[PDB]
Amino acid sequence: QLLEQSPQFLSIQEGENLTVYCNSSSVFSSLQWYRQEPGEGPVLLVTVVTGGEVKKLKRLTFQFGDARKDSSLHITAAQPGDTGLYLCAGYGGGSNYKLTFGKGTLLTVNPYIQNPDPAVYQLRDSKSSDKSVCLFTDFDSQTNVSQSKDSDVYITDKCVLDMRSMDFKSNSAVAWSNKSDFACANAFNNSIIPEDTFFPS
Amino acid sequence: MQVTQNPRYLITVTGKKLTVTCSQNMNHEYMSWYRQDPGLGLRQIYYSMNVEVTDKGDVPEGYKVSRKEKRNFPLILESPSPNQTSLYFCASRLTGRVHGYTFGSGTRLTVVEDLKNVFPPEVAVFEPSEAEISHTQKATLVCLATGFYPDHVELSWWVNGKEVHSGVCTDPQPLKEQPALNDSRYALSSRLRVSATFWQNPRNHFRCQVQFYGLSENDEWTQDRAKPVTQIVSAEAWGRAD
Ligand SMILES: [Cl-]
Numbered sequence: 001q002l003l004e005q006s007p008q009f010l011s012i013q014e015g016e017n018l019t020v021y022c023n024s025s026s027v028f029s030s031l032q033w034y035r036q037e038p039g040e041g042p043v044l045l046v047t048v049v050t051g052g053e054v055k056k057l058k059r060l061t062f063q064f065g066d067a068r069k070d071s072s073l074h075i076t077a078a079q080p081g082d083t084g085l086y087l088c089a090g091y092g093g094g095s096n097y098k099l100t101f102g103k104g105t106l107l108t109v110n111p112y113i114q115n116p117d118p119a120v121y122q123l124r125d126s127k128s129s130d131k132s133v134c135l136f137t138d139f140d141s142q143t144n145v146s147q148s149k150d151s152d153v154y155i156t157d158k159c160v161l162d163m164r165s166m167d168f169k170s171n172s173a174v175a176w177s178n179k180s181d182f183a184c185a186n187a188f189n190n191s192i193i194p195e196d197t198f199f200p201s
Numbered sequence: 202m203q204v205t206q207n208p209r210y211l212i213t214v215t216g217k218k219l220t221v222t223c224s225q226n227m228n229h230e231y232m233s234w235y236r237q238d239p240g241l242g243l244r245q246i247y248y249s250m251n252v253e254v255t256d257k258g259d260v261p262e263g264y265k266v267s268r269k270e271k272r273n274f275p276l277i278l279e280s281p282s283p284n285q286t287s288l289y290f291c292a293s294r295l296t297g298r299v300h301g302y303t304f305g306s307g308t309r310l311t312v313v314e315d316l317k318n319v320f321p322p323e324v325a326v327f328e329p330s331e332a333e334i335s336h337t338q339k340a341t342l343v344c345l346a347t348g349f350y351p352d353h354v355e356l357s358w359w360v361n362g363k364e365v366h367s368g369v370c371t372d373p374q375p376l377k378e379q380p381a382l383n384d385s386r387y388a389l390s391s392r393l394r395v396s397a398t399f400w401q402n403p404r405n406h407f408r409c410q411v412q413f414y415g416l417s418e419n420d421e422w423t424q425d426r427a428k429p430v431t432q433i434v435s436a437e438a439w440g441r442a443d
Contacts, residue, residue: 001259029298030298030299032301032302034301034302038373038374039288039307039309039374040306040307041204041290041292041304041305041306041307042243042290042302042304043304044301044302044303046301047298047299047300047301049298049299087243089243091298092298096256097231097248097250097256098245098248098256098258098259099233099245099248099302100245100259101235101242101243101244101245102242103241103242104242117336117337119332119333119336119337121330121332121333121341122330122332123327123328123329123330123341123342123343124327124328125325125326125327125328126325126326126327126328126436126437126438127325127326127436128325131325131327132327133327133343133345133390135330135333135341135343135392137333137341138337151380154376154378154388156372156376156390157372157373159370159371159372159373159392160370161368161369161370161392161393161394162367162368163339163367163368163394164367164368165367166396170394172341172370172392174343174345174390174392176345198336200330200332200335200336201332
């Protein structure tokens with residue numbers, strides 16, 4: 001009644017291949033793979049029943065070991081649309097008819113950024129000049145945005161937007177606070193960012 | 202293939218009996234309820250192999266089900282507890298091991314200890330930096346929705362009154378504003394990026410819309426502040442010429 005999936009989290013660059021794993025100590029009647037987008041129902045990818053089978057669905061390859069306890073999911077040439085939670089679930093096993101999920105591999109496939117221009121900008125409230133946010137933007141895909149150690153400072157994770165008419169993508173993260181010390185120069189200091197990150201006055 | 206869960210969002214006060222419904226017309230024998238929580242993954246609550254056949258999953262405590270009909274599989278919370286705040290999925294499948302689930306689209310249930318815990322969002326638009334404009338020839342607006350509870354919101358952007366998806370990214374989930382608290386309010390951010398010239402036209406209008414799913418007339422409200430009913434809260438700005 002326990003399925004371990006590794007890795008728990010996986011960030012991959014567009015175009016790389018990758019493998020995620022599902023191992024249990026229980027013997028199941030079948031193992032079943034799903035992909036889930038956030039707050040949406042999981043969608044079935046495939047079921048494996050026969051020890052040792054290999055199922056290929058386009059760039060996705062599923063394997064079920066001969067001993068029937070291990071399964072892997074391999075993806076060729078990862079695309080940003082592959083992003084999602086990849087779930088394995090075990091059905092049955094001779095005692096009962098439960099269908100038990102592992103905790104998934106949350107796969108994030110980061111898009112190639114052609115021309116990074118890392119920068120931190122200050123933006124002011126349309127209604128209230130004295131209220132502002134800091135925007136870290138245009139950093140490359142491998143940049144990792146960390147949380148603050150100050151609980152008075154909120155920092156989002158990075159998000160990619162696509163300006164379709166300009167065929168342009170860009171990453172950004174947002175930080176905000178109430179404190180007096182809060183300057184956009186320092187907002188993202190818990191992150192390891194490029195030395196050439198642009199800080200306007 | 203359809204499994205239908207309604208409602209998508211649900212607030213109940215703790216202790217008030219609740220039923221979440223699920224239906225499928227695919228003639229599937231096996232139906233199941235799961236809950237999905239941060240850190241804990243999907244956990245099976247109850248399942249039903251066929252009409253009038255039910256079995257406990259791993260987390261049955263505080264729930265009951267029935268299967269009087271093949272098409273329907275209600276989940277009943279007799280005395281809902283705050284610990285039953287979760288994202289609930291119904292799923293169905295044919296019986297045999299070779300067959301997999303078709304999932305419903307989820308029910309986000311928040312069980313509130315007290316209705317005074319419920320707050321609508323405040324929404325603000327932060328205007329693009331002149332430095333960004335100079336440096337990139339682009340202009341990013343930021344929307345921040347703050348102070349809301351539960352986390353039952355949908356954020357959208359509207360430019361000249363038309364919904365836009367191009368140039369937008371919204372955080373995949375809200376963050377807790379006071380993460381130590383079991384009833385913490387939430388914040389959510391989004392970005393809309395346009396060309397600098399588009400921002401600089403004062404005829405252009407930008408609106409961040411947050412649909413909040415809140416209380417209805419069903420719900421008793423005794424606080425001094427306005428009742429936090431289902432409602433849209435927006436912030437808007439015009440392009441700037443100066
Ligand atoms: Cl094996």
